[PDB]
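Field guide to reading this record: the first block holds the primary sequence, the second block holds the structure written as discrete tokens, and the final block holds curator observations. Each block starts with its own label. This record concerns Osteoclast-stimulating factor 1, catalogued under organism Homo sapiens.

BLOCK 1 — SEQUENCE
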Amino acid sequence: QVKVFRALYTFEPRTPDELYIEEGDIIYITDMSDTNWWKGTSKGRTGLIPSNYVAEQAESIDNPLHEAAKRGNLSWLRECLDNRVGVNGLDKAGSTALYWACHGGHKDIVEMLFTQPNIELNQQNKLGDTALHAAAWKGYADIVQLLLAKGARTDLRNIEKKLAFDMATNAACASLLK
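BLOCK 2 — STRUCTURE
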């Protein structure tokens, strides 16, 4: 199970065996059992990283796919997927990355997520909202359209007893859902 970090400060390597990590770079580590050196991947390169650097000069990222999706960062989303972050992972509120992509109107992300094996469309979060609820609320009819074509259910109600249809903020979304 991959563990994901953001560099807080630049790491400049002392051996060719070490990665040159810059501030803000994302680090993927799978094996953290060894004492002093861990194997990680950053910027498409794999190498050894001092465990001390990761502890002192990086911050862990609990939901990297969700963050990428939420801010519409397609390059980072693809990187997450490449490093085996699960497409259907749930954050603490029971939301998927797809939910956040739709909440932000990030069609680029939705399309990329739809390339993934067995994408779950119908996850209801803590509040009972699906990605389709968020898309309807967001008001981009073309993203509603994409979700519908991919198989999104329209018969699921949130804690407020609302269907995705009930969330629609414009007639374009309303028409697609009616």
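BLOCK 3 — OBSERVATIONS
The first strand starts at residue 3 and ends at 7.
The beta strands are 3-7, 26-31, 37-42, 45-50, 58-61.
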